[PDB]
Amino acid sequence: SQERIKAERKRLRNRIAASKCRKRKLERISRLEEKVKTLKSQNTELASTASLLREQVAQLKQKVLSHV
């Protein structure tokens, strides 16, 4: 009759806490997925630039050797 309303307040506080937890977690996950996507893109570009540079260094070294 009066202890019960306090216990209902505690229950509601628990459900609220759990909801806020779930939200914070979902925002965190979403953010992490965005960061993983961005990093994948960047590393793709960088990997391309590195590959092209390796090709160019190979050609150059071949030329240098041709003059030995």
Partner 1 sequence: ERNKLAAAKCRNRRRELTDRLQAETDQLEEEKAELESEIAELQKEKERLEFVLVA
Q: Determine the residue type at 11.
A: R
- Identify the residue among 43, 58, 59, 61 touching Na ion (CB under 5 A): 58
Q: Does the footprint of Na ion cover residue 54 (CB under 5 A)?
A: yes
DSSP string covering 11-59: HHHHHHHHHHHHHHHHHHHHHHHHHHHHHHHHHHHHHHHHHHHHHHHHH
The minimum distance between CB 25 and Cl ion, in angstroms, equals 4
Q: Which residues bind partner 1 (CB under 8 A)?
A: 17, 21, 24-25, 28-29, 32-33, 35-36, 39-40, 42-43, 46-47, 49-50, 53-54, 56-57, 60-61, 63-64, 67
